Design a protein around this ligand. Structure first.
Ligand SMILES: Nc1ncnc2c1ncn2[C@@H]1O[C@H](CSCC[C@H](N)C(=O)O)[C@@H](O)[C@H]1O
Ligand SMILES: Nc1ncnc2c1ncn2[C@@H]1O[C@H](CSCC[C@H](N)C(=O)O)[C@@H](O)[C@H]1O
Lengths: 55, 228, 226, 59
């Protein structure tokens, strides 16, 4: 996923801002972390997984 | 679960695209997209709707959300641009900011939502005021042939009539702008001699399914804040 | 009071001829309108009044107003309509005689582009519509439909020739949200075999197909804001 | 035109209230009469049930 596209993404749990961590970069591998919840949403093969944790 | 139910459809995603395009092409052509618009595709499947909107209407940013990780891996593999992105998500909690999306599209997915009324409220939330939701479905009350679909699906589906879709959109705060049936004119209907087929007992039923009922489309518009 | 072409059409049967041709695409635009039983609808430039009769028959509208600038046109529409739930009045697109937020939906077919001040007419429609109400604006004279350009040579009224994008921008500028914009094909008109051309109206089958199938009727749907 | 449908009509010039005068009716149906602008004083005739609500400059 293009880093610029992440500007409107939010934590699925409470709709708060996310923090981006990059491992391979167009982001291929990394994570989006909830600034309020601490939840970690992984980005794998350019695809963020933004399901609520329990899913 | 969504990934349990739809991973076999990701092993067939192109087959869904080929069938659904027969009516989706007409619904997509109606969308009032301006070049550069941001669109969210709920239950993207192969991602074809985003690619069609970029190719024909010049959307600027697209997000194809799906609860099946295999489905969005496929959708990304079929896409030749990074302006269209894909993500795993769920219809009950959309991971987009308030008032951040110009339009939302969904074809053949909405009725799998666990809490369809809450999904409509989430769509009204993420849409900018004046933005549209194009909801296209083949599983609905008037399409009598679709009722049996629940028998081969493990997810509890929502079966609403045309009126129930209009009422639910208004209850979620969306204004209903249009509601229509889009016929599938492409699917071949054999001669009456060829019946019964695996799906149809009579030619009359097949014609009614595709040429008469077709796909239901309901269009909602997100409002600005107003007195309640 | 000054007579114009529309007054002549009302006297010579062209109101009924327009109904028969326009119904080919109007029926599809009307069918998709989200009109509920009991709603109040205004038809701007009603002509024969067929769109209100169709909305009464298919949607169960409670009240209908057919407005036209031609007294003869509305006298004919009234004569063609056997129910008093549909009313007709003489009026002008530049100043609509309805209260603010009093109408559920507004319909107009093959008429909007005659408005003297289209931007003001759009503002008037947004004014009379209730919030969330729609404006269905269907036209066959527009920029992309190259076959319609010559129509201006056959009518003395200065017509607005807008593209698809210009209709969407004008709606926004007038305060309407744009919900839909579609090209409605005419699947009723007889398009003869290629060897039957030239006909009286078309040099080739390709030109006729382009007019009625590729371009067809432009429908732009506006939604009144709160 | 039905008198019950006139509740949403207004003077086209300034959108002010109209006063209805009836000369002939059939129940709710107003057949002959006029709608008079309460501010402009403009008279909009109702002729065989059809109000002529064109601005005065067009009549
Ligand atoms: N609750 C939910 N959240 C997210 N995605 C869901 C979902 N329920 C179903 N889906 C997804 O919705 C899609 C339905 S199949 C339709 C796919 C595509 N829109 C097409 O027209 O062909 C599947 O890809 C499925 O995984
Ligand atoms: N400025 C104006 N105010 C009111 N009516 C107008 C007008 N300009 C044109 N009209 C009316 O608009 C109509 C255009 S012809 C279309 C008639 C009808 N809607 C149909 O689909 O067949 C005519 O009846 C004409 O008298």
């Amino acid at each position: 996923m293009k880093e610029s596209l992440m500007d409107i993404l939010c934590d699925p749990l409470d709709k708060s801002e996310l923090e981006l961590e990059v491992d391979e970069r167009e982001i291929i591998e990394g994570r989006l972390i909830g600034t309020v919840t601490g939840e970690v949403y992984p980005i794998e093969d350019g695809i963020p997984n933004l399901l609520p944790p329990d899913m | 679960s969504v990934r349990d139910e739809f991973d076999a459809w990701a092993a067939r995603d192109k087959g869904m695209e080929d069938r659904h395009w027969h009516t989706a092409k007409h619904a997509l052509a109606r969308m009032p997209v301006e070049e550069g618009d941001t669109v969210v595709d709920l239950g993207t499947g192969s991602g074809y709707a985003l690619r069609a909107l970029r190719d024909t209407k010049g959307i600027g940013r697209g997000f194809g959300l799906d609860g099946s990780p295999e489905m969005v891996q496929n959708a990304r593999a079929y896409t030749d641009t990074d302006d269209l992105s894909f993500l795993v998500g769920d219809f009950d909690d959309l991971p987009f900011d308030d008032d951040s999306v110009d339009h939302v599209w969904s074809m053949e997915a909405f009725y799998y939502a666990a809490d369809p009324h809450h999904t409509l409220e989430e769509i009204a939330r993420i849409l900018k005021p004046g933005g549209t939701f194009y909801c296209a479905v083949n599983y609905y009350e008037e399409n009598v042939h679709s009722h049996e679909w629940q028998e081969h699906i493990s997810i509890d589906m929502t079966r609403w009539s045309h009126a129930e879709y209009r009422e639910a959109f208004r209850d979620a705060g969306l204004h209903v702008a249009e509601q229509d049936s889009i016929a599938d004119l492409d699917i071949d209907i054999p001669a009456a001699t060829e019946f019964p087929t695996d799906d149809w007992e009579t030619r009359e039923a097949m014609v009614e399914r595709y040429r008469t009922f077709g796909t239901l489309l309901t269009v909602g518009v997100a409002p600005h804040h107003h007195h309640h």
